[PDB]
Ligand binder design. Structure first.
Ligand SMILES: NS(=O)(=O)c1ccc(NC(=S)Nc2cccc(I)c2)cc1
Ligand SMILES: [Zn+2]
Length: 257
């Protein structure tokens, strides 16, 4: 199975998922001097006030906080998007050290971690149909740097003990994802892919300019999670990030001058 180790990591993925070398792969480096301001871009609309979180899951690659997406409760729209995208889950990618961990980079700078809030286009009826479409998903990416703690993250951090190993899940209702956002909604956007297998080229990427700060103690507890299942040799869940992929024939647009 694919992973992030020496023998099954990002350099291996193309063998089972040929699209790894495709024309709109993610993540990418965001070159801030080359990204063009696009005045025709609309403000982002994040409507999370009716969000219903259900569960948190260690899936052996990261942990997912899952939401009830059987109704328009938590949706993303506007920006570069047409139509409504429902929140289905969010997850993080992070490093073994504070100097690495994000998937996207900004002028080659790596952040300590990166949050992905995953949304699917309601015109395709379910998530499985949506990932088969070029405009099927919208993922909102948010960088994390280490500094002051993020109060809105602590509920997540405190449950990680109960989902230490692969396949474990825990009840996680009444969590408000609005506590994970930065102040500004300024963003870059470009067409890309899932950053893990099957690497489908179905994503409109929306990456926020402003990082959130988390504490060293918060990211430390990320790093205490396990890739392996219970009763297996311990491998710490760290460096579950794919590095920057060739931009090729794409332009990154900025929502801001
Ligand atoms: N890291 S990311 O580009 O935000 C991202 C978002 C969603 C997924 N995978 C979803 S949740 N599961 C999935 C998707 C497509 C096919 C299959 I099989 C499983 C995988 C990666
Ligand atoms: Zn991700």
């Amino acid at each position: 199975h694919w992973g992030y180790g020496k023998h099954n990591g990002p350099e291996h993925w193309h063998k089972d998922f040929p699209i790894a070398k495709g024309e709109r792969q993610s993540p990418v480096d965001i070159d801030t001097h080359t990204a063009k301001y696009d005045p025709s871009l609309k403000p982002l609309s994040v409507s999370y006030d009716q969000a219903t979180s259900l569960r948190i899951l260690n899936n052996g690659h990261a942990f997912n906080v899952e939401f009830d997406d059987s109704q328009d409760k938590a949706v993303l729209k506007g920006g570069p998007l047409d139509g409504t995208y429902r929140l289905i889950q969010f997850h993080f990618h992070w490093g073994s050290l504070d100097g690495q961990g994000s998937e996207h980079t900004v002028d080659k700078k790596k952040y300590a971690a990166e949050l992905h809030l995953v949304h699917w286009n309601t015109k395709y009826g379910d998530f499985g149909k949506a990932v088969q479409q070029p405009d099927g998903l919208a993922v909102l990416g948010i960088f994390l740097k280490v500094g002051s703690a993020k109060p809105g993250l602590q509920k997540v951090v405190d449950v990680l003990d109960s989902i230490k190993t692969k396949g474990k899940s825990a009840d996680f209702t009444n969590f408000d994802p609005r506590g994970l956002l930065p102040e500004s909604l300024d963003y870059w956007t470009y067409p890309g892919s899932l950053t893990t297998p099957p690497l489908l080229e179905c994503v409109t990427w929306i990456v926020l300019k402003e990082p959130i700060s988390v504490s060293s103690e918060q990211v430390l507890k990320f790093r205490k999670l396990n890739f392996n299942g219970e009763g297996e040799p311990e491998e710490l869940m760290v460096d579950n990030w794919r590095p920057a992929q060739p931009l090729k024939n794409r332009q990154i647009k900025a929502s801001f001058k």
